[PDB]
UniProtKB/Swiss-Prot annotation, chains A, B, C, D:
It comes from Homo sapiens. Disulfide bonds: none annotated. It is found in: Nucleus. It comes from the Eukaryota. Residues 23-84 form the BTB domain. The chain holds residues 2 to 120 of 677 of the full protein. May be involved in transcriptional regulation. The gene is ZBTB5. This is Zinc finger and BTB domain-containing protein 5.
């Protein structure tokens, strides 16, 4: 086994996302556009996987731009931090996108 | 202009659902099976529409059987009454299923 | 209550009907094929409920293609315009299909 | 922190790799075609990042089909096991693709 392999892969994927490198899709929330790779977005979110199987619009009231950005960062880094976004918005956005690990953790801390 | 036409249609669809008539799909939550029409579930929510486009297995932890039963009753009757359930579970299930009008109503009353 | 919910659902169903999405039956009138959902046709009238208890052929003399198109549009829109059809044709088609609200309106305006 | 998140993501990536879903490239080794995600091959290798800056032709004289299959399985599983190939074949293929963790493991065991 190669511990650390996946972390390096995700670090490179985060670089690519930040610089738009090899990104094959764009998600639009409100007036913000987020770059993403279909293979990761679909692998993490069942809903996105169903949608893919180039621009995807999300409801701007259910999923806010700040909660979305935080969820994407978590998606590629395993670290979820907010700022300009609260717990209720990240919880509902995670539910909307079927990010079950996030939904379970948020439910745990909210209760 | 034929007011009430949609009410009679939904009443008949609900009858069919209760008796398992003309039902082309089943949703399984935990160990409980809910019969449903593919076109109604797809019309009610973007997620079901995308998934359909016979048996669908839902995560029983995120969407409980009671919340699902309440949401399907609402979908076929327009009224969402609770029982063996509460606001937090009906809201989380509505979010999971993209029942945006339910999510908005629940956020309104929860806050 | 959720006013506008049913109108949005029917608008989406009409979209599907026009594009042939998630349609489980075809009605043939004369030399034209009209795609439709079994659950909606059955809900609108007991004639189809009995018939459905893939393709249904209607008599071309009793129900003309224009009257059928007008009524099928009504079924998903609540608006029934004669278009190229005569009132006698929409009357007879409505009677054959037991669309009693249409039959009543036609009788009202036969003079 | 969400332990196990990356493992589930890679499990889904490997599933779709085997089924060829949502994949944007094919690597050809000898006369065998291996479907892959450009974002993952590039993330794991500087060489692929340069190459992608649809179909990639590898030199069958150095990168054999067996070594390639083993290395792609490693990339999508974290566990590298020999198949029909021997250690030298895997080392040479890892070197060609700059999969440094494999090159180091191979040198360790060869020494």
């Amino acid at each position: 086994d190669f511990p650390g392999h996946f972390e390096q892969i995700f670090q490179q994927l985060n670089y690519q996302r930040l610089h738009g490198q090899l990104c094959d899709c764009v998600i639009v929330v409100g007036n913000r556009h987020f770059k993403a790779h279909r293979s990761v977005l679909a692998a993490c979110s069942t809903h996105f996987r169903a949608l893919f199987s180039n621009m995807i619009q999300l409801d701007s009231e259910v999923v806010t731009a700040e909660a979305f950005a935080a969820l994407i960062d978590m998606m590629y880094t395993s670290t979820l931090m907010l700022g300009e976004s609260n717990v209720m918005d990240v919880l509902l956005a995670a539910s909307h996108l079927h990010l079950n690990s996030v939904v379970k953790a948020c439910k745990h801390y909210l209760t």
